[PDB]
Design a binder for these strands. Structure first.
Ligand SMILES: Nc1ncnc2c1ncn2[C@@H]1O[C@H](COP(=O)(O)OP(=O)(O)OP(=O)(O)O)C[C@H]1O
Ligand SMILES: O=c1ccn([C@@H]2O[C@H](COP(=O)(O)O)[C@@H](O)[C@H]2O)c(=O)[nH]1
Ligand SMILES: [Ca+2]
Ligand SMILES: [Ca+2]
Lengths: 288, 445
RNA sequence: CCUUC
RNA sequence: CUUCC
């Protein structure tokens, strides 16, 4: 009817294998904090599977409210992992974050001097950057840039080891100038706006070898096209082989993400673990 | 309401306008801590005192305070931070002391030849007595906690050869984070000593409780329960040891660490014992073919020095021909990411790396420095560890190895004390040295 | 207050 | 930063 048999979800952007012309005619509750709970549980999980996350400090800029983040925190704590959580954001954070010794809550907004400060402060602890910087309706390329411009600075300053950066190509028809964003895999996000082109730029650093990828409008077309395909054709399909309670692409996608997450508690099949996580996850935000 | 109650019953005073809001979060944590019998505790450290710490300069009324004395600082501590800090630690005692610590109180010589021999082939190179008491606790520990603490290092071999001169009971445990906090207090109490617990940015998942004066009391490595299983575990004396086979592979991987060769050109005998105690184990366990004769060993390792990455040809053993041994972990990681691979096998501080086999090829990171017999020439004692490494994987995954290892060993039997031309500069691991000061009330990571 | 849920 | 089974 509108089903399908896949081998694996499109994990990263380099993996979408088709396009579709964006047509502007363009499903849960508390889903905002979810899209994130995964990309973040996912990002850091890798950093752990590769070590990086060991006793490092996560500097989340553009966090608040950041309800989910608590979950994440509880996850790793429960995992023995050691991490200081620095959340900076001009707006405030979901109270469920106060009183946490492992979490500092800055109620300030970022700029040049500021990074230079915290950097000095935190150093030499290794830093892990998670930017979700914002700027109603949907950011103008004008802002999109200033933001990215700013994210590329945090990077250069906090000179982190790994970083999960917000990344949504600026609409072609509204293009302005080009820019560079750090090199790094771009993961598609589950349970994300029906038609969003947002995706986190996951990138791990070499040390004295930063790398940026020049972004061009030709490049931008590819996005809209490929992305749109994903959102309209891909996600709206049903993985009939995927032996999971829920079979929507996203749940299938969300599966493949958690499959890589770590959890001490002993579990039989993976479906077993994932399913629990999912459960526990949805539990947290409180989604049926 | 019941909330403000707990805060005063804990603060031994009224909470300030702020203090309330802060601690407000620390519900039962703070409540539980309180309606928790201190006495029973006071007597449990005592019941322990005499058993692993019978020989101490302390008294029942003296100690008793310490314990209470600690659970009493809530009333003097006015620094919200220090407050939050002492609460998280009081809670470690409260929930784990009982479960984790309190519970406590309830043939070979043959290869001595080969040892010297294989050892020689190489040889081309250049702490407070609380240690004791503890080393007495740890014994019982491994016994009590089989599945939540496994051991290795020097100690272990003495459990197969009581003729093995060890110093530290080395371990891997799923809760090391707690384990140390507890012990920390154990010592901080009975002793009356102000110890410190630190994490060393260099080692992965590592916290060594040192002494008030930096006297290495005892160090530990933490590992996921996940990993805890895949580890080649062995039983003997109601305690689990890291299967000596495996333990011998690192043996080989260790000696590719020049630093440790400036340690070999020292105690040529020290290792000479642990050594054979291993050559002996397997030879007897899996009847290891011990005849100087041995083919396809030390696979041709090619060290591109411009990328700081080796290239081993496991081919003659495993499906994958090459094994790209990286020397810059932080690199391998990104490239791995680039490989779009997110299910790499990480065996924490064990293998000290994450092995990957994207497209019939093995990618990995060697935790040590590489030995050169000449410019671009990978000194053999390198292909030693290099191999083992892989095998470690092979072992934590249970695969066709016996063969290769036996093969690898024979390649060690009498060889040129080949000169060491140069060596690689191991990638620097970042991170601030974090510690816990039970005494000064400071927590930092 | 002898292993604190 | 030194602090490395
Ligand atoms: N480069 C390495 N990577 C991973 N593990 C290693 C490495 N080098 C040594 N090890 C592990 O450390 C273990 C013991 O450390 P070590 O103290 O140096 O020898 P030991 O047998 O414990 O003798 P002592 O503890 O000094 O009395 C044995 C080995 O599996
Ligand atoms: O978690 C912490 C961090 C710092 N401090 C100590 O408290 C004092 C003031 O720090 P503030 O609180 O940040 C300093 O001695 C600092 O080392 C704590 O007690 N706990
Ligand atoms: Ca040791
Ligand atoms: Ca040790």
């Amino acid at each position: 009817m509108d089903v399908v048999s896949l081998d694996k979800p499109f994990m990263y952007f380099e993996e979408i294998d088709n396009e579709l012309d964006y047509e502007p005619e363009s499903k849960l509750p508390y889903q905002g904090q979810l899209k994130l709970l995964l990309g973040e549980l996912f990002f850091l999980s890798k950093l752990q599977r590769h070590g990086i996350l060991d006793g490092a400090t996560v500097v989340y800029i553009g966090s608040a409210p950041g309800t989910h983040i608590r979950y994440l925190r509880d996850h790793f704590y429960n995992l023995g992992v050691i991490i200081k959580w620095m959340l900076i954001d001009g707006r405030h954070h979901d109270p469920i974050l106060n009183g946490l010794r492992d979490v500092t809550l800055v109620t300030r907004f970022v700029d040049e001097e500021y990074l230079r400060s915290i950097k000095k402060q935190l150093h030499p602890s290794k830093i892990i950057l998670i930017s979700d910087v914002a700027s109603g309706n949907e950011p103008s390329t004008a802002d999109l840039l200033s933001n990215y411009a700013l994210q590329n600075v945090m990077i250069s300053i906090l000179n982190p080891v790994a970083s999960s950066l917000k990344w949504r190509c600026p609409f072609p028809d509204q293009w302005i100038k080009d820019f560079y964003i750090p090199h790094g895999n771009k993961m598609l996000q589950p349970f994300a706006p029906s038609y969003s082109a947002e995706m986190r730029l996951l990138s791990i650093y070499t040390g004295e070898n930063m790398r940026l990828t020049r972004v061009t409008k030709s490049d931008a077309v590819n996005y809209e096209k490929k992305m749109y395909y994903l959102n309209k054709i891909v996600r709206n399909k049903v993985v009939v082989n995927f032996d999971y309670p829920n079979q929507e692409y996203d749940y299938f996608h969300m599966y493949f993400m958690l499959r890589t997450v770590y959890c001490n508690k002993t579990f039989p099949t993976t479906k077993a673990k994932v399913l629990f996580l999912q459960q526990s996850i949805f539990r947290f935000l409180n989604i049926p | 309401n019941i909330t403000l109650k707990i805060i005063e019953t804990y603060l031994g005073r009224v909470p300030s306008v702020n203090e309330y809001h802060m601690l407000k979060s620390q519900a039962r944590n703070i409540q539980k801590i309180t309606v928790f019998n201190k006495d029973i505790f006071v007597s449990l450290v005592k019941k322990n005192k005499k058993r692993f710490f019978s020989d101490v300069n302390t008294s029942a009324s003296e100690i008793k305070d310490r314990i209470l004395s600690y659970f009493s600082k809530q009333t003097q501590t006015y620094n919200i931070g220090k407050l939050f800090t002492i609460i998280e630690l009081q809670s470690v005692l409260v929930t784990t002391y009982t479960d984790i610590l309190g519970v406590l109180t309830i043939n070979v010589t043959s290869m001595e030849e080969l040892a010297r021999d294989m050892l020689n082939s190489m040889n081309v190179a250049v702490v407070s007595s609380l240690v004791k008491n503890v080393n007495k606790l740890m014994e019982e520990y491994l016994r009590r906690h089989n599945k939540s603490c496994i051991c290795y290092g020097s100690y272990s071999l003495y459990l197969i050869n009581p003729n093995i001169r060890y110093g530290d009971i080395d371990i891997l445990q799923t809760n090391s984070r707690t384990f140390l906090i507890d012990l920390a207090f154990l010592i901080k109490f009975i002793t009356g000593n102000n110890i410190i617990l630190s994490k060393i940015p260099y080692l992965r998942n590592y916290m060594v409780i040192k002494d008030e004066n930096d006297n290495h009391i005892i160090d530990s490595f933490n590992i996921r329960q996940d990993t805890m299983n895949v580890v080649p575990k062995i039983f003997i004396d109601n305690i689990y040891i890291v299967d000596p086979t495996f333990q011998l592979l690192n043996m080989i991987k260790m000696f590719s660490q020049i630093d440790r060769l400036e340690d070999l050109s020292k105690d040529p005998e020290k290792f000479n014992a642990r050594m054979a105690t291993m050559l002996e184990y397997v030879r007897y366990t899996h009847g290891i073919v011990f005849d100087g004769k041995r083919n396809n060993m030390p696979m041709k390792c090619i060290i591109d020095e411009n990328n700081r990455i080796v290239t081993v040809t496991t081919k003659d053993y495993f499906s994958f021909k090459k094994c790209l041994v990286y020397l810059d972990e932080n690199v391998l990681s990104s490239d791995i990411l680039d490989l779009n691979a997110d299910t790499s096998c990480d065996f924490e501080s064990v293998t000290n790396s994450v092995y990957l086999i994207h497209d019939n090829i093995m990618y990995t990171y060697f935790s040590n420095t590489i030995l050169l017999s000449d410019k671009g020439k990978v000194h053999e004692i390198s292909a030693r560890g290099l191999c083992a490494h892989i095998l470690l994987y092979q072992m934590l995954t249970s695969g066709e190895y016996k063969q290769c290892l036996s093969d690898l060993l024979n390649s060690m039997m009498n060889r040129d004390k080949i000169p060491i031309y140069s060596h690689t500069e191991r990638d620097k691991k970042p991170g601030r040295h974090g510690f816990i000061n039970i005494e000064k009330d400071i927590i930092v990571f």
